[PDB]
Design an enzyme around this catalytic site. Structure first.
Site, mmCIF file in Angstrom:
data_model
loop_
_atom_site.group_PDB
_atom_site.id
_atom_site.type_symbol
_atom_site.label_atom_id
_atom_site.label_comp_id
_atom_site.label_asym_id
_atom_site.label_seq_id
_atom_site.Cartn_x
_atom_site.Cartn_y
_atom_site.Cartn_z
ATOM 1 N N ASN A 174 1.064 -26.206 44.428
ATOM 2 C CA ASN A 174 2.041 -27.280 44.199
ATOM 3 C C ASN A 174 2.383 -27.384 42.707
ATOM 4 O OD1 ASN A 174 3.631 -29.468 45.258
ATOM 5 N ND2 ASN A 174 2.069 -30.931 44.563
ATOM 6 N N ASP B 233 -4.420 -23.312 42.217
ATOM 7 C CA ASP B 233 -4.034 -24.644 42.704
ATOM 8 C C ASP B 233 -4.227 -24.690 44.240
ATOM 9 O OD1 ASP B 233 -1.640 -26.631 43.582
ATOM 10 O OD2 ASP B 233 -2.239 -27.195 41.532
ATOM 11 N N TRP B 234 -3.252 -25.177 45.002
ATOM 12 C CA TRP B 234 -3.354 -25.155 46.470
ATOM 13 C C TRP B 234 -3.439 -23.770 47.075
ATOM 14 C CZ3 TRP B 234 -5.335 -28.525 49.584
ATOM 15 C CH2 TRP B 234 -5.333 -29.885 49.232
ATOM 16 N N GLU C 165 -7.660 -22.103 37.680
ATOM 17 C CA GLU C 165 -7.220 -23.493 37.856
ATOM 18 C C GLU C 165 -7.152 -23.821 39.358
ATOM 19 O OE1 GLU C 165 -6.299 -26.332 35.765
ATOM 20 O OE2 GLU C 165 -7.949 -25.250 34.803
ATOM 21 N N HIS D 111 -2.849 -26.270 33.125
ATOM 22 C CA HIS D 111 -2.987 -26.051 34.568
ATOM 23 C C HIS D 111 -2.191 -24.885 35.081
ATOM 24 C CE1 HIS D 111 -4.103 -26.746 38.668
ATOM 25 N NE2 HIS D 111 -2.839 -26.986 39.050
HETATM 26 CL CL LIG Z 1 -1.311 -31.512 44.325
#
Ligand SMILES: [Cl-]
Ligand SMILES: [Ca+2]
Ligand SMILES: [Cl-]
Length: 294
Positions: free
Chosen positions: A37, A107-108, A131, A271
């Protein structure tokens, strides 16, 4: 190098009645790059070139993101982790990846990739991550600067912040990249989310799914399961640490640093480190893959 041009050409495939978009370039065993995301395959555009000729380079747009179709009808109970996983599992099946897959996650993409790897361990040749959500989270793991905002996403305020005002794309994304983005780069990131309302739902449903302080219980369980597994798996790993970094610092970095058979490098970034250090990241992944595929 840096640059706003995407990598390769977008391909499309029907999965569970919806069109999903992906990049698939070259031949051989796949190196599979998964965004989270509020990004898309575009996140990897300056990284994937470093793997040229080391295998089949694949980057999928998650459902409702990038050039993939929106769910219809969209709403608050849509775009859960479970729903994303159903589409992504089906897409990865359809792509005929074989049994020597290298995963590259963020991330996701890391929750999805780590879970898929746990469920398909015999097919995973290597895992490169950065990350990432390496285990279930607590508010204390969350950087202090983001606690109130993410708590707000996970409240009734989330719809105005994200669906009406596009805060994840317009505020969080550039806020967690150290170098300034170009006009063309922001245009590519905002394109899937130009329209107010449900077009932006994936970017709100995601923060609502983050396994934090035991909620949501299903995602917590999935992350707990892969945390246990990864901490014992002899699958080769590449941990791309970031400085200052963002998510993968403190306790959850202490944890992933216990994972076996792991090489680590550190690059500049917060990030979305792909926008800060794409060449260092791509070079590291390439060296990892070359060692996996001599
Ligand atoms: Cl998120
Ligand atoms: Ca910035
Ligand atoms: Cl083979």
């Amino acid at each position: 190098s840096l640059g706003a041009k995407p990598f390769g050409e977008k391909k499309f495939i029907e999965i569970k009645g919806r069109r999903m978009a992906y990049i698939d370039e070259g031949t051989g065993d796949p190196i599979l790059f998964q965004h989270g995301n509020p990004t898309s395959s575009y996140l990897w555009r300056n990284i994937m070139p470093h793997c040229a000729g080391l295998g089949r380079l694949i980057a999928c747009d998650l459902i409702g993101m990038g050039d993939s179709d929106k769910l219809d009808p969209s709403g608050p109970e849509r775009y859960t982790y479970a729903e994303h996983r159903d589409y992504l599992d089906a897409l990865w099946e359809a792509l005929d990846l074989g049994d020597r897959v290298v995963l590259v996650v963020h991330d996701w993409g890391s929750v999805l990739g780590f879970d898929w790897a746990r469920r398909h361990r015999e097919r995973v040749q290597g895992i490169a991550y950065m990350e990432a959500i390496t285990m279930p989270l607590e508010w204390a793991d969350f950087p202090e600067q983001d606690r109130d905002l993410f708590q707000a996403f996970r409240s009734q305020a989330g719809e105005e912040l994200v669906l009406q005002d596009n805060v994840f794309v317009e505020q969080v994304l550039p806020g967690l990249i150290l170098r300034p983005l170009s006009e063309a780069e922001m245009a590519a990131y905002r394109e899937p989310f130009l329209a107010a309302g449900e077009a932006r739902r994936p970017t709100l449903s995601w923060p609502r799914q983050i396994p934090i302080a035991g909620t949501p219980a299903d995602v917590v369980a999935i992350a707990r399961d892969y945390a246990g597994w990864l901490s014992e798996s002899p699958i080769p790993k590449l941990f791309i640490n970031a400085e200052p970094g963002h998510l993968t610092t403190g306790r959850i970095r202490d944890f992933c640093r216990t994972w076996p058979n792991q090489t680590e490098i550190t690059v500049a970034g917060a990030h979305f480190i792909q926008e800060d250090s794409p060449d260092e990241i791509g070079a590291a992944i390439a060296a990892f893959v070359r060692r996996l595929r001599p």
